[PDB]
């Protein structure tokens, strides 16, 4: 699963929320958070789209968008407010084991970058969504409803942070709805110096190796060496 | 099963050698070439081990006695604390220094 | 009176890097799971008793191979599809009206 700032359709921890980092005191490293229970998220594009085929050569067709029947609205995602509250409480409780018991811990939003790294970018049934997560990471912690995230749709896609190759995604016909599990987070810490009593964490991502490092984290590969010599008291006859 | 006695003593792991022995041979074009090389490398490793065993005079055997006496400078532990209070992973880490000398002695003893 | 004895099939291992292959349960998909080996219904997992190992999450070589495989499959899936070179022309575009909302103003364009 390719996504940014949020881990989807993954694996859940067995006992508690797990916090992993290569060097937790180095703020240049990313923090991987693994949840104990998932957070359900519902995303949708509500427009009724039409697809038209245009013959651009012998045996070659191009799929364009036709007309949108009905009204035009904005694609968006919904998350639960109480569940996110509980999850953030557990996450901050686990975070307070590395930075102290009396440190104020606040969540802010992203800071600078292109559209892929400053938004939750994912793929929902053929359509590439870029959702704004300023309502998820905005709070501070001192020692029924829903959250609606507006999203944007793009059709020219540059994957794997490369240049020189672009992909065009043909339109999907009809209304689109998807439901997913949030099972983890990628965070980065601001280097607050000069006797800072507060810590600020911001969503991160961009490198897909940390997406699959959260699944291949308990495996290793070994090579067998089936030859040994030992002292016995048997002599060749 | 496979690698089951990795935490057991050296004596207990000497009765299940065939389990490890069996699991060494069978247990687009870009990906097709990569998979083929793995099988070729496994075959080559198996054949090199078999050739070494045959040269030492131990062809077609899992346990093989030799005429080379054990030098006390390789290890001073007695048989009671080697085969009953030790694993192969610890034994390798201790005798890794003298392996080549022992191999050369085995070769020159079998040839002569 | 001790002699060297050779054992073939001891439970010893070392750290290594190799090419792992893909398997999938048993058609048009970006990741060609059809071209991978079918998976067994009940895989074997052998618990190694009294064995302590060392792991390093941040220096694992399986992640690099997985990244390379994903990128290669994505690149391979696009070879037989249509090139859109004639689409790089000048478009004449107008704003979209007729039952848009306030938040959807200027997000769609009608281009000829």
């Amino acid at each position, epitope marked *: 699963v390719v996504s940014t700032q949020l881990l989807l359709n993954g694996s859940l921890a067995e006992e508690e929320v797990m916090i992993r980092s290569e060097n937790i005191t180095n703020n240049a490293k990313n923090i991987l958070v693994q949840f104990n229970t998932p957070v359900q998220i519902n995303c949708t594009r509500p427009n009724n789209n039409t697809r038209k085929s245009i013959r651009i050569g012998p045996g070659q067709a191009f799929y364009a968008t036709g007309d949108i029947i009905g009204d035009i609205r904005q694609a968006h995602c919904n998350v639960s407010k109480a569940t996110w509250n509980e999850t953030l409480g557990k996450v901050v409780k686990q975070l307070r084991k590395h930075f102290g018991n009396n440190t104020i811990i606040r969540f802010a939003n992203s800071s600078g970058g292109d559209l892929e790294v400053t938004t939750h970018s994912f793929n929902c049934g053929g359509e590439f969504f870029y959702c704004n997560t300023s309502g998820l990471f905005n709070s501070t912690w001192i020692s029924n409803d829903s959250i609606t995230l507006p999203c944007r749709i793009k059709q020219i896609i540059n994957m794997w942070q490369r240049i020189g190759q672009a992909m065009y995604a043909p339109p999907i016909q009809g209304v689109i709805r998807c439901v997913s599990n949030i099972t983890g987070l990628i965070l980065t810490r601001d280097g607050g110096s000069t006797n800072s009593t507060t810590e600020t964490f911001r969503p991160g991502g961009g490198d897909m190796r940390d997406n699959w490092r959260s699944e291949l984290y308990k495996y290793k590969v070994v090579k067998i060496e089936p030859l040994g010599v030992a002292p016995t*008291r048997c002599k060749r006859r | 099963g496979f690698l089951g006695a990795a935490g*057991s003593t050296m*004596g207990a792991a000497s009765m*299940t050698l065939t389990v490890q022995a069996r699991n060494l041979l069978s247990g687009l074009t870009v990906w097709g070439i990569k998979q083929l090389q793995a099988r070729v490398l496994a075959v080559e490793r198996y054949l090199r081990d078999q050739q070494l065993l045959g040269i030492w005079g131990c062809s077609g055997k899992l*346990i093989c006695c030799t005429n080379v006496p054990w030098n006390s400078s390789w290890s001073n532990r007695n048989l*009671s604390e080697i085969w009953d209070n030790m694993t192969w992973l610890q034994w390798d880490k201790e005798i890794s220094n003298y392996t080549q000398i022992i191999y050369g002695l085995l070769e020159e003893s079998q040839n002569q | 009176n001790l002699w060297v004895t050779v054992y073939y099939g001891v439970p010893v291992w070392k750290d290594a890097e190799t090419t792992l292959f893909c398997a999938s349960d048993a058609k048009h998909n970006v990741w060609a799971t059809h071209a991978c080996v079918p998976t067994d219904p009940n895989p074997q997992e052998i618990h190694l008793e009294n064995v302590t190992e060392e792991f390093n999450m941040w220096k694992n070589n399986m992640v690099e191979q997985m990244h390379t495989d994903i990128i290669s499959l994505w690149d391979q899936s696009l070879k037989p599809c249509v090139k859109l070179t004639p689409l790089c022309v000048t478009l004449q575009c107008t704003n979209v009206t007729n039952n848009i909302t306030d938040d959807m103003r200027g997000e769609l364009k009608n281009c000829s």
Partner: antibody
Amino acid sequence: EVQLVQSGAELKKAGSSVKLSCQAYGVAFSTYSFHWVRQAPGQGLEWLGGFIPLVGKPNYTNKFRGRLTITADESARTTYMELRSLRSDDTAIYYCAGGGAYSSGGGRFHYFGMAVWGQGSTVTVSS
Amino acid sequence: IQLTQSPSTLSAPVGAGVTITCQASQSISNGLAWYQQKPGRAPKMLITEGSSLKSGVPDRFRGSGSGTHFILTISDLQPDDSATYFCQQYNTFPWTFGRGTKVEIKR
């Protein structure tokens, strides 16, 4: 560590059969040698039998040949001893012991004794 | 194979050393084990392989010998050493125990 747990005391009749169980904790059961010994009141020790479960062919004393059976159960990891046609002199304390062995090839096995002992079971036959 | 253990009984004061001799009817290489037993308790192995000291056993017990003659020596007698000692062979089936020696304390 390794521990052996035996059954309780047994009272039987002459000409009957007695079965004792011994369960092991802390070792691999298939490659560990298990032995049954007995001690008469006020007398010495008498090694009855012993075997490695993997080999599957127990060794017996010629005196008790035809009256003693030693079996194993790897699923429950317990060894059973069956003694048939008990006589008046079979009232004694029976011990279950264990030890480690290795192989030098060609069907040769080398042992080290009986390092682990059970608490013993008292077996008595009378009217 | 028959094992003869001598002396049958022996008593010494605290601080002295005692020796027990186990003699085999035929060569058993060096496959002999020395066991200790206290009244109302299961036997406990002291020495294996003839001279290898078991783990958790005090250094006061020493075993030596070869061929058909083996010796067990207690250098520093202690109040807990009054017990029955056995020598057993495991080199060839069937395994046989010695008659045992009851070491007593003089005070």
